[PDB]
Amino acid sequence: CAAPDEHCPFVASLLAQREGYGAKATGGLGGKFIEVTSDQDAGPGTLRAALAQARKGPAWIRFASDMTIVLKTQLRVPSNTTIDGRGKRVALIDDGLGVYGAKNVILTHLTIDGRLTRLTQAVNVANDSRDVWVDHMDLSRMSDRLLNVKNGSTDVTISWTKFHNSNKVMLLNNITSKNLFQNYERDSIARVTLHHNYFFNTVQRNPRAQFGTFHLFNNLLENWDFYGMSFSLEAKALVEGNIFNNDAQRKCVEPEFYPTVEGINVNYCRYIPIAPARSALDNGDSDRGAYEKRKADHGYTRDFKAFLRLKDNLYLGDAKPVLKDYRPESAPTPSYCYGYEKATPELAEKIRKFAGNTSGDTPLPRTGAGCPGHH
Numbered sequence: 001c002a003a004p005d006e007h008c009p010f011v012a013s014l015l016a017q018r019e020g021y022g023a024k025a026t027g028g029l030g031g032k033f034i035e036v037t038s039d040q041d042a043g044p045g046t047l048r049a050a051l052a053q054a055r056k057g058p059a060w061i062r063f064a065s066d067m068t069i070v071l072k073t074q075l076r077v078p079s080n081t082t083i084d085g086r087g088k089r090v091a092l093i094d095d096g097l098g099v100y101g102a103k104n105v106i107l108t109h110l111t112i113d114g115r116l117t118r119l120t121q122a123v124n125v126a127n128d129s130r131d132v133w134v135d136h137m138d139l140s141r142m143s144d145r146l147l148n149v150k151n152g153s154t155d156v157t158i159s160w161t162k163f164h165n166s167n168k169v170m171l172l173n174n175i176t177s178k179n180l181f182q183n184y185e186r187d188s189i190a191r192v193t194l195h196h197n198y199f200f201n202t203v204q205r206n207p208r209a210q211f212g213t214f215h216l217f218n219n220l221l222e223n224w225d226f227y228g229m230s231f232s233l234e235a236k237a238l239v240e241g242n243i244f245n246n247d248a249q250r251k252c253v254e255p256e257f258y259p260t261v262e263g264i265n266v267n268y269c270r271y272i273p274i275a276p277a278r279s280a281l282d283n284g285d286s287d288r289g290a291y292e293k294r295k296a297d298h299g300y301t302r303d304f305k306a307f308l309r310l311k312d313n314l315y316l317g318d319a320k321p322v323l324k325d326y327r328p329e330s331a332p333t334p335s336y337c338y339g340y341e342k343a344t345p346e347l348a349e350k351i352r353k354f355a356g357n358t359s360g361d362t363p364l365p366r367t368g369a370g371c372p373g374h375h
């Protein structure tokens with residue numbers, strides 16, 4: 001490991017774990033190592049300085065020591081870059097990572113905690129970004145968003161990541177026009193795989209997904225305060241082997257208030273007793289009102305609902321099923337090979353143990369249509 005090539009064992013070990021729509025990402029493979037030696041927001045040896053250097057050519061960024069990096073603005077991640085916090089405890093505080101117009105990016109083993117300090121995002125994959133792998137992250141306390149994949153971005157895998165202690169967690173595409181399908185051609189190309197993630201002590205949008213093609217398998221949603229998942233507007237999703245666990249009688253752990261653009265907002269603690277039955281919003285409910293009000297003038301021929309195929313999802317504790325198959329024939333049958341596990345309480349335990357920015361290893365356990373010899 002003089003360089004991040006296929007012969008470097010920790011490069012090879014990481015790349016062996018790839019699966020899903022982001023599985024082609026190699027980040028800084030074949031480029032240079034850059035070792036972050038300063039924990040400052042900016043300056044020599046900083047993460048920000050490393051990312052600037054990474055604009056010049058493929059870079060695999062590692063950290064010299066455990067560090068807390070208090071960010072004043074969001075970091076911008078260029079193409080062909082890996083940010084690799086393995087072997088160290090690295091936390092980004094108050095701001096996060098923007099992946100804008102970038103191809104071929106791997107983010108692994110980092111903590112990002114917004115502390116509700118400012119209106120920003122932990123991981124923002126936007127504006128024609130592609131081939132992005134978000135792995136073993138620990139993301140929390142963003143007053144805007146933990147993670148977006150939006151605005152013509154595609155070919156993304158989110159794996160083994162702990163999303164916690166935050167309100168509006170994840171958007172898979174957004175809506176920025178009154179005509180709900182105005183950006184459909186642009187955003188329907190989004191292909192995103194979510195597997196082995198842990199959504200714990202969050203409020204909502206776990207994820208909220210529209211327009212694109214999504215595969216959610218073997219995720220654990222636990223102790224949400226408002227709703228778990230939401231799908232609408234011809235999202236096409238295969239939702240399989242996930243575990244939803246909740247209890248209507250538990251102590252609230254939300255902050256007293258949330259900062260917002262319009263000022264201070266109350267928390268969602270009063271919804272705890274009705275949250276378990278809202279494992280998801282009903283299919284299409286996120287945008288149904290707008291769709292029904294606007295369909296007269298816009299003449300929508302696309303569905304307000306998502307096309308869903310659901311298999312082998314658990315509903316534990318007080319959690320109750322909501323989502324059912326709807327036009328399942330139009331949901332994806334992913335072209336790739338993936339390591340699907342039967343949904344059991346033992347799987348939930350595995351996810352709680354290993355999801356996030358953890359020290360233990362998560363090698364792939366694989367059959368399916370995309371698996372040569374093992375269909």
Ligand SMILES: CC(=O)N[C@@H]1[C@@H](OC(C)=O)[C@@H](O[C@H]2O[C@H](C(=O)O)[C@H](O[C@H]3O[C@H](C(=O)O)[C@H](O)[C@H](O)[C@H]3NC(C)=O)[C@H](OC(C)=O)[C@H]2NC(C)=O)[C@@H](C(=O)O)O[C@@H]1O
Nearest residue numbers: 168204205208226227230265268271274281285286287289
């Ligand atoms: C139990 C229940 O579902 N009650 C809701 C109301 O929820 C409240 C008052 O908490 C209310 O729902 C609207 O407000 C929600 C909220 O305050 O968090 C959600 O809104 C957030 O997300 C939507 C979204 O489309 O995803 C928008 O971006 C909102 O701006 C955002 N608001 C804030 C403060 O962050 C509800 O949206 C979703 C998707 O669940 C939002 N509902 C709608 C249709 O816009 C109420 C209402 O319609 O205003 O509906 C129920 O009674």
